Amino acid sequence: GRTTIAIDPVTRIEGHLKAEVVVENGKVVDARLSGGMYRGFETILRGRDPRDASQIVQRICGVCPTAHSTASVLALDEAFGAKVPNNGRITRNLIFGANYLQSHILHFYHLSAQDFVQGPDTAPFVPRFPKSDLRLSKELNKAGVDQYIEALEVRRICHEMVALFGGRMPHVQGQVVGGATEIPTKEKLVEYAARFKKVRDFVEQKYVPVVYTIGSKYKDMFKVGQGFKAALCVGAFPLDNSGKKHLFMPGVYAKGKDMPFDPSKIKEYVKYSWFAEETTGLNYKEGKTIPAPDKAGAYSFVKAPRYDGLSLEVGPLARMWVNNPELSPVGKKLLKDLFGISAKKFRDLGEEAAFSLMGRHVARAEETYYMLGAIEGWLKEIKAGEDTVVMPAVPASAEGTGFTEAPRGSLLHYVKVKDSKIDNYQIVSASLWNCNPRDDMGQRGAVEEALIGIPVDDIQNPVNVARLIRAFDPXLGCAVH
Amino acid sequence: RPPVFWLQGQGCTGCSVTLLNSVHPSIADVLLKVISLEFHPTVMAWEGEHAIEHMRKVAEKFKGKFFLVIEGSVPVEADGKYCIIGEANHHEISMVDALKEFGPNAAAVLAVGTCAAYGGIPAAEGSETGATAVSKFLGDNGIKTPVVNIPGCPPHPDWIVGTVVLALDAIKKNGLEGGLAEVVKVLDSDGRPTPFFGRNIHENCPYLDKYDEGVMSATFTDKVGCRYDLGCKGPMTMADCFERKWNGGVNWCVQNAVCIGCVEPDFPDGKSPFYQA
């Protein structure tokens, strides 16, 4: 009556993930996610000049390196007592914001779109499941293919935008403790804005509309994948120099209630993770990373982070739900025309549809549009020629914590400095919050829980298991580090 | 049209991403006409044991003829458990086991990125996984398949595409075996193709005059002085970034900040601290 299905590797995600589900009566009734590759950045970092961290940490993940760069330099700014100049704050936002655009476009088209769109008869688009549940008309399927192709150009241009003030991408050189290493010039700002206009036009004319339109052919996918319906945002993209106003403000949402974010309530459990038993339940400021790849009962190199005991999700849905911004004009219009829904702000989708497989794709498209407005603002705010960096001394003893939102969700880095070197460095990343295993009390990770109830009407073609997973845009390099 | 299988061990997917940024005129043709990218977990249609079995069926049909792109280091500690890349009918396949299986049957291996080439960050001080470079791992296990290293963290897409072009031209001219022999001749002692890694950054740097004058920037945002005092490792680095630059030519590390020596076998530890000479 029960069938167990193992999928390793889960593809069209970043990194190494195995999913194992139990299916009964056409639905997933249990799930386990395993991050199968470990590097151990938190131990590699020890003993180094703390400034090296803002380069080393980016190699956690070549899809979201600017997020790690950001978290690291914010931690270092605190630990070093560095006051980032206004123009450097804005420059950092321009470097990092551009990769949100890159990452969301990459995710929808190059990772996710094949979930709904049939590719041509050439590798790597074939072979695939014989019954892949690809529902789109000839015309809409062609639009998907055409836009996947166009999006290769668009995402590349986004990395050109990152590199203009960031040096190169992947792995920017341009963010350091104390700000940004290159003052924007008038000429390079023109270059950034020219590219940004191309990206804006693609987002507004192609990407946002196609997510809603494809969604309207898969309305069933708004009815599954709810999981815990609980979300975390730790804040990101400072809008002033006093650490208060941010593009995304922090908050936690759980059991229908909004509450403030208090980072002291974070603990990382390890019973079901391949780490030493004695390291369970640590807040990141006391974090330890002691691998135990043979430990019985464990099934992942991802730790299990919990917020005041809660298993939460992160990412565009979390941020857009917590902040509840106004919807895009194109989204409002398609909600009306295709779905019969009058909606002004993101929460007008309702909790059930927002916290769903397709809801998460919609949130990511809406957030891409939202980010266009922010970048437009920063391009008006930035001042050509104004200094972007200070050059602080390395402290002998210090600590710092950097909080930001990577494209996939909440990210923090904690550094403790002793004898002018890294004594401890702990990372709590977005796909860690999403793709973690059970905690010590048996509570599933967010994606494990969201898998519960996913339809598998055909065990020979169990395509919705990985469709659900892809909606969260995992990167297991980040989750495990 | 030979198959390519792209296997990642302890990498960050930066090699795939950097390739997605290629504006090389030949890249579309490489993918659509010259080779067939049959397995690549980040971008392929299928998944799981089906994807693994697809690669195995293709590999069997093209035994001796397929190409492996290997990204990331290969961790040998704990019996390979620090990197599992798939499962076939309940049987886990570690990166160690994958290379022992496919390695002997490939025409050649491209070790892309400093991790695969030399061990890189996963092999750096403080690591515990037995992260091993591809050529070393294969040699240690008696596998003599040719390996070309295309390092960088990440490599420039032109280094990857350009090495493929080099190989294509050589193989057209002399056949598979003879072609690979001609490619060997243009590799340096660290297995890197000399067209991309045969020149020193510092000897070709636009700030070399300032270095020689002893005019050093004291803040990163001073773009007039040489970056040596800020930690630039250009003097010890063999790469052509000074010329092709990065991301469609919009910038490069030395203009923006400092070179961190990312293509070199001692990266990162031998190039650290990054922000001191």
Ligand code: SF4
């Ligand atoms: S030290 Fe760096 S910035 Fe100075 S001349 Fe050499 S490569 Fe150029």
Ligand code: SF4
């Ligand atoms: S300039 Fe130096 S750090 Fe930058 S890509 Fe080239 S070799 Fe790597």
Ligand code: FCO
């Ligand atoms: N985006 C991103 Fe990376 C992940 N998950 C981080 O943090």
Ligand SMILES: [Cl-]
């Ligand atoms: Cl990022």
Ligand SMILES: [Fe+2]
């Ligand atoms: Fe961690």
Ligand code: NI
């Ligand atoms: Ni990531």
